[PDB]
Amino acid sequence: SDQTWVQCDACLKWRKLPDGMDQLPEKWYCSNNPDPQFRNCEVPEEPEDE
């Protein structure tokens, strides 16, 4: 299984999502992140795995 990411339409950062989130709004923003650690556009984009 792979990691899903979604791009914030405001800040253009990619955010990891939980597996199985197969329904998202047309536009998505950091503020909608289920993870409170990554719920603000100012939080840096997490790196990908090596």
């Binding site: 791009q7 047309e26 795995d49």
Partner: peptide, 11 residues
Amino acid sequence: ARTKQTARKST
């Protein structure tokens, strides 16, 4: 929304 998948070796 715009999404992508990346490899996750731990799984």
